[PDB]
Amino acid sequence: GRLIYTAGGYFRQSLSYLEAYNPSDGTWLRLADLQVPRSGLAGCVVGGLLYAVGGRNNGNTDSSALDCYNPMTNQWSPCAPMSVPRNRIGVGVIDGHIYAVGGSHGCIHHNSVERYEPERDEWHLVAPMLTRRIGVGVAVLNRLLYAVGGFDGTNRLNSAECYYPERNEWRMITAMNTIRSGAGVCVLHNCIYAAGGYDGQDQLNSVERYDVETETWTFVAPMKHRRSALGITVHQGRIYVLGGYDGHTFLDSVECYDPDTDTWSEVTRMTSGRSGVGVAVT
Ligand SMILES: CCOP(=O)(CC(=O)Nc1ccc(S(=O)(=O)N(CC(N)=O)c2ccc(N(CC(N)=O)S(=O)(=O)c3ccc(OC)cc3)c3ccccc23)cc1)OCC
């Protein structure tokens, strides 16, 4: 029985909350705070350890930090920092290694990507992306890392591209129907989902599914609450989006997508509304 973990976030200030949610019984656990409050970070899991990557402390400062959380010890532990601060970062995991994709340091918009080895507490740059991307969605599919949407410092993007680890190179893939920075991007039943985000003028509630075989993006059921900078994860075959910003409110709503019925239902509320959380399941 795995939990949904939500790290950090933002409401008025950068937060240090670490909370876990149980879809079996609707309960929320309060876990050990982060050492430094952060928003705009990303979460991931490797070997049953929770990792919190990048973001910003909002002195106000973009983070190159990597911190590890052990659910068994309920303790945070610092790791090797990344080569560069990465606010509004995307991450994915390939064979127990963490890819940090894009993000920002001040006005710098990264296209660089570095890879973390837990077994060595070491980071190494890999091939840079074709596009600078901050607020980028990241999904791992078929041992390929996909980087979806974001902002390149000039335009919001509907483009997407693909990293080939054995070849260490990136190719553009089919663009999305909608422009999206700060979307929720995950993988479910062999498709990439892109939920929400910001299209340049408003926060979106549309949801597109990328089907690899056909190389097409098709819309599916939209969310109840439009949102960007949302947390997202997959748990027992359904999608969960957590919090985010809808243009005026910092949401505490958690919506759950069932792909068998193509429905979104609100399933719980966070203990407080927040944006820019890092989210992971273990
Ligand atoms: C000028 C008229 O005023 P306005 O109301 C209209 C407006 O532009 N809304 C708006 C437009 C586009 C986006 S975004 O999601 O796409 N995005 C930009 C990007 N380039 O990626 C992002 C913005 C902020 C982030 N956060 C962490 C951080 N380190 O920043 S946060 O969650 O904690 C946050 C904090 C404050 C806030 O607002 C009060 C909203 C959110 C993001 C974190 C991850 C990914 C993308 C983020 C968000 C809001 O807002 C003025 C302040």
3-state secondary structure string across the chain: CCCEEEECCEECEECCCEEEEECCCCEEEEECCCCCCCECCEEEEECCEEEEECCEECCCEECCCEEEEECCCCEEEEECCCCCCCECCEEEEECCEEEEECCEECCEECCCEEEEECCCCEEEECCCCCCCCECCEEEEECCEEEEECCECCCCECCCEEEEECCCCEEEEECCCCCCCECCEEEEECCEEEEECCECCCCECCCEEEEECCCCEEEEECCCCCCCECCEEEEECCEEEEECCECCCCECCEEEEEECCCCEEEEEEECCCCCECCEEEEC
Ligand 1 contacts CB of residue 42 (under 6 A):
no
Which residue shows structure tokens 């929720």? 184
Report how far residue 142's alpha carbon sits from residue 167's, in angstroms, rounded to the nearest whole number.
14
The token pair that represents 52 in the structure block: 């919190």
Q: Whose CA is nearest to atom 23 of ligand 1?
A: 229
> Containing domain of residue 281, as a range?
1-282
Tallying the residues shown for the chain, one arrives at: 282
Ligand 1 contacts CB of residue 228 (under 6 A):
yes
Closest atom of ligand 1 to 151 CA is 20
Closest atom of ligand 1 to 276 CA is 32
Domains of the chain: total: 1
Instruction: Give me ligand 1 centre to Cα 71, in Å.
Output: 30
Closest atom of ligand 1 to 9 CA is 33
The token pair that represents 247 in the structure block: 């243009």
The greatest distance separating any two alpha carbons of the chain, rounded to the nearest whole angstrom, comes to 48
Ligand 1 contacts CB of residue 92 (under 6 A):
no
Ligand 1 contacts CB of residue 10 (under 6 A):
yes
Mutation to probe ligand 1, out of 107, 228, 241, 250 (largest number of atoms < 8 A from CB): 228
Ligand 1 contacts CB of residue 149 (under 6 A):
no
Resolution of the structure, angstroms: 2.7
Mutation to probe ligand 1, out of 39, 110, 151, 245 (largest number of atoms < 8 A from CB): 245
Ligand 1 contacts CB of residue 181 (under 6 A):
yes
Q: Whose CA is nearest to atom 17 of ligand 1?
A: 182
Q: Whose CA is nearest to atom 4 of ligand 1?
A: 247
Instruction: Give me ligand 1 centre to Cα 245, in Å.
Output: 7
Give which of 61, 63, 62, 73 is closest to 18, Cα–Cα.
73
Ligand 1 contacts CB of residue 251 (under 6 A):
no
Asked if 173 and 146 count as a contact pair (C-beta separation under 8 A), the reply is yes
In this structure, which long-range contacts are made by residues 142-147, counting pairs with CB atoms below 8 Å and at least 24 apart in sequence?
142/212, 143/94, 143/95, 145/92, 145/94, 145/99, 145/101, 146/92, 146/173, 146/185, 146/192, 146/210, 147/90, 147/101, 147/102
Q: Whose CA is nearest to atom 2 of ligand 1?
A: 247
Neighbours of 42 (CB within 10 A): 30
Closest atom of ligand 1 to 275 CA is 32
